Structures are given as C-alpha cells and as structure tokens.
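Side project, low priority. Logging it here so it doesn't get lost.
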Amino acid sequence: VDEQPLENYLDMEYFGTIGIGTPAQDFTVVFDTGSSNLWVPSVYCSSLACTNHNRFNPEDSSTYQSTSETVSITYGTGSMTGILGYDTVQVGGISDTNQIFGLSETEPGSFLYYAPFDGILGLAYPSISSSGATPVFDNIWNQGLVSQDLFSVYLSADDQSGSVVIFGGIDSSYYTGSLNWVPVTVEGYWQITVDSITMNGEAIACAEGCQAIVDTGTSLLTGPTSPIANIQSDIGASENSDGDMVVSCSAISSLPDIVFTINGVQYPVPPSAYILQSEGSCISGFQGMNLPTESGELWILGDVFIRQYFTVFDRANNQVGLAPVA
C-alpha cells in the first residue's frame, strides 16, 4: 500500500515531492484531480516562474528520452507551454518508468511565480490530457505497478500534516462508516451528479440536479455566478472594497449546514468549513465561476468539500467513493 504524503499550504493547496529522472531530481507538484497532465519547469524556461522554482535538466538524466512534441496547458490561474519528454517518475514509492511529461519552456504571469509548488500532477482521465499525453495514474496501471486501479485522498484541515494520496488502495482509519459509491457521469474530470443543494430543508441551488467535479486542485466551492449570488445572500455575505465576500465571524454559530445530496445521500458542510478565516476577518468559501460544458454548467467540489469527506477515485468501475473523515 503505496502512500504519497502531501503538505498542506494554508488550506488552499496540497502538494508533494516527486522524483523525476536517473538519478532523481526532486519537484513539488499539486496532486490535481481536475487536470490530467504532469509537468515540471525545465532548464529551457527563462520566465520569472522558472527562475525561482526547481528546473528539470534532461542532460543530468541517464533515462531521459526526447520527443519533437509540445504541450500547451491553460488553467483557471495561469498558462504553460513546454516540450514532451519520457523519464522515470518516482511517486508514492512507485517507480513509474516510461512516463511522458512536460518540460516547461514558458510559464507566463505572477500566480506560478508566488506559488510554493513547481508543477502539476493531474489525476483525472486521459480524455482531457493536453497533447493526448498519458496521465501518471494511467501509466502506473498500464505497467501493472498497482493491483487495485484506484487511488484515495485524505486532505487535512487547519494547516496540519497528515494529508495523503494512497495509490492502489484505501485505508479505513481515515474515515468513519462505510464508503458510499457515486457513478462518474462523464469520463474526463471526476464528474458526478449532485441531486440538490439545501439549507434547512429548502433548495438554495441545483433544485432538480446538477453536474459537479471533485477537484483536489480547487481551494473553494465553486458554481455558476447566478446560484452562487443567492447562496452568498443566504449566508449574509457582502462584497467589500478589496473585492472579497465577507461574513461576520461571530455569525458562524447561527448558520445552518449546507447539504449536498449525492446519489440520495446527504453530505453536510458545516459553517466552520464553508466560511474561512483570513486575517482577523472571515470570508465565504463560495466562488462564482461559470464553466459551460456539454452537460450544462459545472459545480466544483473543491478542497472545502474534500476535507470533510475521504474520497476514493476508482478507475476500474468509474466511481467516486465518499465517507466522512475520522
């Protein structure tokens, strides 16, 4: 049972140390269930972000194989272009040989410059992988390096250690009860149906069902701007001068749980999880961001949700498994 420990950065980001190449060069990567590519900065990159992060050198690796292929990825926050190469990636005690990954050439902007991590390790489906590059978990499975074709995530709260990604296993000590299994609707992101979102037995959004993605790489609970506007009023959040959605800290004690009903099961998120503490004031864990797809407009069940529920991502049966954290 192969475990990758993750560091918690201010309850906003979760990343861990991987080794790429022979001998291994170390990187910090976001373990991200909302994307499917692996990339790190390389010596071919001269953008500001590449000057203050760890840079892969293909010339120091006996196992590096080059391609003539490039990759370009756009995230919610930032952009990279790079070249695809093959090497051994050491992740969670697994030696993932013949792993295609991106070596950055450009990392425009300021987000990637101030971020504590060097790259991203995507854990979603091959269908959303830029340049059809094989994701890490797919290459681990295809080579028969695990027995169970699932990984499970535990994300700690309140800046504590203990977060992990467990490749090729589950560990019962992290959750109370038994796992509830939810079918993936569309195989790209880890996409599921939410039946309704409620507060005190009244639907506040997604009254007749909506599509959501379970994303380790998003900090907050995200949804369409219009439903999010109602939720912000419902919790007494007001916009301030800096642009932030503030709520009275004192008011946590009188707010109801918001309930996410998934596959006929109730998943409550308490006010102490969905209102966050940032600098003596308290802000809303809800963010409006319109993401249109073939299957309507998406909600993101970000880290605010995943902290409350141990999550198992099952590729053999195309299911997400949820249970309350211990």
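Brief comment: The helical segments are 48-51, 111-114, 136-142, 225-234, 271-274, 303-306.
Revisit when time allows.
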